[PDB]
């Protein structure tokens with residue numbers, strides 16, 4: 001039972017709000033779209049189809065009723081354009097900012113466009129939200145910001161040195177958000193995601209994340225590569241936990257705002273064990289090589305979620321094995 | 337005497353280099369242009385005249401030889417456009433990046449514009465220098481990076497939270513510089529200026545700095561406003577010290593690179609004391625209200641410069657009194 005979350009959702013259904021989702025055609029964005037429409041919220045969506053896809057939007061349309069779909073206004077546009085940022089803010093209550101170009105490798109190889117997308121784009125959205133006087137503002141941050149801090153588990157208040165331009169951009173989102181609270185009274189929540197996974201995470205392309213990447217290859221009978229020794233470890237966190245945290249953040253009490261929260265489950269899985277896990281789960285629905293470490297890549301990652309548990313009454317319910325199980329059927333349909 | 341600096345300056349007279357100065361039409365940039373052309377260097381300049389002035393360029397031209405001036409290539413353009421950054425970099429040995437929009441209050445009113453010049457702008461120049469593989473890269477950082485840290489005097493390795501949008505941008509300069517060193521081997525030096533003053537520091541404009549502002553007001557007989565009770569203190573730094581630190585950094589040994597240095601005197605002067613000192617030196621060339629503290633003002637500011645003295649052989653040889661004596665005639669001229 002996700003008790004607090006249950007209750008917040010009940011409020012929303014009775015007293016529906018207008019939400020903006022940037023990144024809405026992407027993985028986490030379209031997941032948020034799915035749930036909010038299912039709660040009868042009015043949603044305004046913004047995406048430029050860079051890493052996101054029209055087919056994410058089409059899938060969501062099939063997952064929700066037609067009255068629900070009718071409360072969704074999609075706007076093709078770019079967060080790098082302040083003007084489009086302000087137009088989409090008009091009448092918004094709740095901001096959920098997911099639009100970014102992710103990936104640590106991407107940032108190393110083009111820190112320029114990524115800076116414009118992830119810093120300039122974020123400030124555009126942040127400033128426009130302030131001027132529009134939204135009720136809340138919750139944005140996607142990153143565990144990569146811990147950097148080279150050696151402590152496990154990772155606690156919000158203790159971070160190291162950024163090890164990639166991607167880490168920098170996400171850290172900058174946090175600092176601008178803090179200064180926005182100091183300078184304007186504008187109180188936000190930043191969510192440091194830890195390896196999110198589930199339905200509609202892109203398996204294709206040179207920047208694919210490890211779970212969909214491997215799943216896709218296992219299905220195709222292709223090779224399953226591992227960047228380094230396989231001991232590199234992570235806190236894989238199924239999207240539903242992320243959707244919970246975004247919605248709790250949006251209706252957080254004021255004292256819980258201007259804070260950063262780890263979003264994860266608190267577990268550690270190595271890349272060796274995951275390789276196993278995905279195979280076992282895919283083999284139930286009836287169907288290995290080592291290379292060099294990825295540069296700018298973080299060694300070990302495990303979240304401490306006590307802070308979100310405490311302040312938001314976050315209840316992480318779906319762990320890695322279950323979440324794989326919920327996902328593999330999605331990837332079969334999608335890749336066939 | 338300025339032993340190491342004097343040594344360096346003689347070397348340059350004998351074996352000229354190509355220097356890029358961004359912000360070349362500004363206060364610090366045009367002072368750097370003056371010194372480098374007097375040392376017969378090849379200088380590439382870039383400025384968009386946002387806060388800079390064509391007349392600073394005209395002034396520098398009257399102070400050097402036509403042959404010296406023939407080695408100044410001036411480009412009117414914006415560090416926000418990467419292409420123009422890449423162009424001004426070809427054949428450059430030493431980058432002195434000074435272009436930015438200063439002023440805390442400016443950045444509160446318009447955080448978007450400060451962001452674009454100070455972070456996007458800075459990152460474009462840093463990336464192009466990296467790509468052109470220059471010998472050195474030195475940038476204007478800021479004492480605002482100390483934020484709310486309570487130590488005084490201020491020591492490079494101990495900083496607090498950034499207290500305005502401007503402070504975020506200057507802090508982010510440092511972070512990107514450190515990330516470029518880790519990621520691409522590209523070692524920069526960042527210079528945390530404290531309260532620089534001297535010739536060609538704009539006395540006009542809403543964001544005018546205190547020494548020039550007060551000096552204009554004294555000569556016109558306008559009201560000298562003190563923002564608070566006058567015990568507020570600063571480490572006022574004559575330009576020539578800053579010129580010094582720039583050139584030392586440009587030619588620093590490798591191990592002195594990827595480091596941050598305070599650039600100041602190490603002394604603390606009150607606003608009360610300063611209003612005295614300005615008057616005193618103005619009246620030797622023969623010619624006061626109290627209001628609210630400015631919002632978000634720093635109470636006391638003083639640098640510890642031993643790291644500069646130690647690693648770069650800096651000599652803070654011009655103190656506030658001397659510097660004010662040297663600057664007062666320039667202001668009398670400029671203002672009549």
Ligand SMILES: NC(=O)c1ccc[n+]([C@@H]2O[C@H](COP(=O)([O-])OP(=O)(O)OC[C@H]3O[C@@H](n4cnc5c(N)ncnc54)[C@H](O)[C@@H]3O)[C@@H](O)[C@H]2O)c1
Pocket residue numbers: 022023024025026027028029046047048049050051052053077078079080097098099100101102103117121140141142143192193194195196197202
């Ligand atoms: N998936 C993870 O494990 C993870 C981890 C840490 C942080 N994040 C962050 O979560 C957020 C959402 O990530 P995701 O995993 O859904 O990736 P994703 O690539 O599916 O979605 C990102 C979406 O943002 C859109 N977008 C990108 N730049 C845009 C721009 N300039 N203007 C408008 N839209 C733009 C893309 O088209 C895409 O739809 C991003 O900020 C990402 O950095 C994700």
Ligand SMILES: NC(=O)c1ccc[n+]([C@@H]2O[C@H](COP(=O)([O-])OP(=O)(O)OC[C@H]3O[C@@H](n4cnc5c(N)ncnc54)[C@H](O)[C@@H]3O)[C@@H](O)[C@H]2O)c1
Pocket residue numbers: 358359360361362363364365382383384385386387388389413414415416433434435436437438439453457476477478479528529530531532533538
């Ligand atoms: N003066 C101080 O006490 C002090 C203190 C801390 C930091 N700084 C920093 O020192 C540097 C130089 O400052 P200054 O005091 O000479 O200020 P300044 O305003 O006199 O000069 C800055 C120059 O940069 C140029 N510029 C601004 N944006 C530009 C852009 N996008 N493209 C091209 N040119 C652009 C302006 O036209 C101007 O000529 C700045 O980085 C400033 O933030 C100064």
